[PDB]
Write a protein that binds this ligand. Structure first.
Ligand SMILES: O=C(O)C(=O)Nc1sc2c(c1C(=O)O)CCNC2
Ligand SMILES: [Cl-]
Ligand SMILES: [Cl-]
Ligand SMILES: [Cl-]
Ligand SMILES: [Cl-]
Length: 284
């Protein structure tokens, strides 16, 4: 790999067994309890009833009334990278979302969806669109201000100021918004996906000096899983002597120990292969 991975890719392509391989992954994936996610009191904190964090990896809010947020810590030990994957916040969980960003000391938020997709609400408007209209989250005592945005053709980078209204301490949060990645679909090219990923890496947001980057789409599993799988596989291919031993299927199953349903379609799995192959070549 890239040679060994590319060879494997062409073989799967030739036999047309992407769907078969993807289904194998779903069958083999971990099935851990999500008791807390499924408590009655948490019903309104979940966007989709079929998408919940495992108890063992769920992010806990440091709040005395209810610690629950639909978010999971994905800790890739060998790759030496962590991510927080979470659903697109609901109108009632935006305060929670930013409480999590604050408490976990994250530097970046990666958003891979749009607020409305095909006429359906997929994510709350959880950040301010206008500088002069800041957002105040009274429940978690946080204020959020748009400082600037860098709008590119297929993604936007925003500078946000998150302020703890209790202490008046402020932090700069980078918001990386992929705006042309359709739900249950794939990016328009490996190149544009990789350019985006590299921008996130270059920002320092994935650095161990900060808390884990927060990654989300609508459910925090399909597009989110695709993004994280590619990043981790690229790390492995660069850190392993004999990078040929990087088995994307095994890495995805390792990730799914931490959150269910990562990568939601066979074509997203196929795209992950392409991204990793093309990216390996660029980095090598
Ligand atoms: O946003 C994504 O990329 C993603 O995984 N979305 C998902 S996963 C998922 C759903 C959705 C959705 O957006 O409707 C609906 C219920 N089943 C699981
Ligand atoms: Cl949007
Ligand atoms: Cl919503
Ligand atoms: Cl591997
Ligand atoms: Cl699945």
């Amino acid at each position: 790999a890239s040679m060994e991975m590319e060879k494997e890719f062409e073989q799967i392509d030739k036999s047309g067994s992407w769907a078969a391989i993807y289904q194998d992954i779903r069958h083999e994936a971990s099935d851990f309890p999500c008791r807390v996610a499924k408590l009655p009191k948490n019903k309104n904190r979940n966007r989709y009833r079929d998408v919940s964090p495992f108890d063992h990896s769920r992010i806990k809010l440091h709040q005395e009334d209810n610690d629950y947020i639909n978010a999971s810590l994905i800790k890739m030990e060998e790759a030496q990278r962590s991510y927080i994957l979470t659903q697109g916040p609901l109108p009632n969980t935006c305060g929670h979302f930013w409480e999590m960003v604050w408490e976990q000391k994250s530097r970046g938020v990666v958003m891979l969806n749009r607020v409305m997709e095909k006429g359906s609400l997929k994510c709350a408007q959880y950040w301010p669109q206008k500088e002069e209209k800041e957002m105040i989250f009274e429940d978690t005592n946080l204020k959020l201000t748009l400082i600037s945005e860098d709008i590119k053709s297929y993604y936007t980078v925003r500078q946000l100021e998150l302020e703890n209204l209790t202490t008046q301490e402020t932090r700069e949060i980078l918001h990386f918004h992929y705006t042309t990645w359709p739900d249950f679909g794939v990016p328009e090219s490996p190149a544009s996906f990789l350019n985006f990923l590299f921008k996130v890496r270059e920002s320092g947001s994935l650095s161990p000096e900060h808390g884990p980057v927060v990654v989300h789409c609508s459910a925090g599993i399909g597009r989110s899983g695709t993004f994280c799988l590619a990043d981790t596989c690229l790390l492995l291919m660069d850190k392993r002597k004999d990078p040929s031993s990087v088995d994307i299927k095994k890495v995805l199953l390792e990730m799914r120990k931490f959150r269910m349903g990562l990568i939601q379609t066979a074509d997203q799995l196929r795209f992950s292969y392409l991204a990793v192959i093309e990216g390996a070549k660029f980095i090598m």
